[PDB]
Amino acid sequence: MRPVLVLLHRYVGLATALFLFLAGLTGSLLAFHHEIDEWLNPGFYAVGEGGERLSPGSLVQRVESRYPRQLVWYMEYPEAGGHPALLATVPREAGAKVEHDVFYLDPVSGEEVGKRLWAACCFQPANLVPWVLEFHHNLTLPGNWGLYLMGGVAMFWFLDCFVGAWLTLPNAYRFNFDLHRAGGLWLWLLLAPVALSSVALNLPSQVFKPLVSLFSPIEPSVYEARGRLPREQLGETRLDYDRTFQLASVEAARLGIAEPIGELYYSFEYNFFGAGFGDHDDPMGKSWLFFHGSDGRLLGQEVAGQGSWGERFYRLQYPIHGGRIAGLPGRIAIAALGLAIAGLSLTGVYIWWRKRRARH
């Protein structure tokens, strides 16, 4: 059964071609997606000249009341000798227009030191890195319409990878074919985990966690779990950010979560808070704890390095996709593969073109 898999590659690799192309090339750009912004957008990464930082709830209230038709749901809370606190917002009137959407505050004086609107188109200073980063996984399509597409392209790319891994395991046309061929089993093996983590990153609840669950049990998120609750049971929101940060340090004591609280999260839709420990430069050591909006009780824990095989195999996908599992080498590594993939998806559509040139 040799040519059956050969046909199965040509039909797959070509459907994938320009999606995988766009996706991977932009992904290379995103290899330094934090770094690019700091170069492009240095106001957002100010110095914060001060001593004692004011409480996460304090910084929230600044933003919620200077912008009375907006609400803070995610915020990055720094250690005050560093980057400006990041508070992210959403309309209060459901589908209202807002001029700005993410806020940078000095964490010692809540005074705004930069604003941004998320993903306006290519605008070099500020909406570039967000736009590339949301175009990359969704080709900026209407909503999940196409988040699904790019995740599907991911699914075929992975399936095509473990076909190619079996099929290959123990001129203009002359040169394009030779370049493309040159990957070997080595390159097919590199491709496989970028595709797999792609599946994880776009269709986590839908494909990847249900498929892994056959091999080890994946507890769903608190977010998965409360999306599935009957709405009357959700309760009414009584906590605030400060009350959460207390509760998470109380719980962090108990579980031995070493790291410090850096992110705080609240979701309207399901009435719960999130306190996430550790910085974005070591995403493998980040933990999360989620608390009920009314009780303050612990709804779920995602303590890094802990859980079931399937669960920590999930939390490795985002570190694997971004190279961070291998440090700056790996980031450089991934920045390379996305270029390779671009090359592949091109050279491979060409050897279709010039094969089709005989019919011309």
Ligand X SMILES: CCCCCCCCCCO[C@@H]1O[C@H](CO)[C@@H](O[C@H]2O[C@H](CO)[C@@H](O)[C@H](O)[C@H]2O)[C@H](O)[C@H]1O
Chain residues that interact with ligand X, rule: CB under 6 A: 207, 209-211, 213-214, 217-218, 220
Selected from 66, 69, 280, 355, the binder of Zn ion by CB under 5 A is: 280
Q: Which residues of 139-164 are buried (b: 16+ CB within 10 A; e: fewer)?
A: beeeeeebbbebbbbbbbbbebbebb
Between 203 and 261, whose beta carbon lies closer to ligand X? 203
d(CA 216, CA 174): 46
Write down the number of H helices and E strands in the chain: 13, 8
Q: Which token pair is 236?
A: 């009414």
Selected from 119, 132, 201, 303, the binder of ligand HEM by CB under 6 A is: 201
In the chain, which ranges are E strands? 70-76, 85-91, 102-105, 112-116, 261-267, 272-277, 287-292, 298-302
Binding mask 21-50 for ligand HEM (x = CB under 6 A): --xx--x--xx-x-----------------
- Between residue 179 and residue 198, which ones bind ligand HEM under the rule CB under 6 A? 180-181, 183, 187-188, 191, 194, 198
Binding mask 116-135 for ligand HEM (x = CB under 6 A): -----------------xx-
Between 322 and 348, whose beta carbon lies closer to Zn ion? 322
Partner whose binding site includes residue 286, from ligand HEM, Zn ion, ligand X, none (CB under 5 to 8 Å by kind): none
Q: What is the DSSP letter of 126?
A: T
In which residue are the tokens 């290899």 written?
31
- Between residue 22 and residue 51, which ones bind Zn ion under the rule CB under 5 A? 34
Q: 3-class DSSP state for residue 52?
A: coil
Chain gaps in the chain, named by the residue before each (C–N > 2.5 Å): 170
Residues 269, 273, 276: CA angle, nearest 5 degrees: 130
Residues 12, 323, 216: CA angle, nearest 5 degrees: 70
Between 33 and 100, whose beta carbon lies closer to ligand HEM? 33
CB 119 within 8 A of CB 132: no
Partner whose binding site includes residue 126, from ligand X, ligand HEM, Zn ion, none (CB under 5 to 8 Å by kind): none
Q: Which token pair is 165?
A: 């891994």
Partner whose binding site includes residue 4, from Zn ion, ligand X, ligand HEM, none (CB under 5 to 8 Å by kind): none
Comparing every residue's Cβ against ligand HEM, the nearest one is: 24
- Which phi and psi (to 5°) does residue 169 adopt? -105, 140
Partner whose binding site includes residue 214, from ligand HEM, ligand X, Zn ion, none (CB under 5 to 8 Å by kind): ligand X
Residues that bind Zn ion in the complex, under the rule CB under 5 A? 34, 280
In the complex, the residues that contact ligand HEM under the rule CB under 6 A are 9-10, 13-14, 16-17, 20, 23-24, 27, 30-31, 33, 133-134, 136-137, 150-151, 153-154, 164, 168, 180-181, 183, 187-188, 191, 194, 198, 201-202, 321-322, 324, 334, 337-338, 341, 344-345, 348-349, 351-352, 355
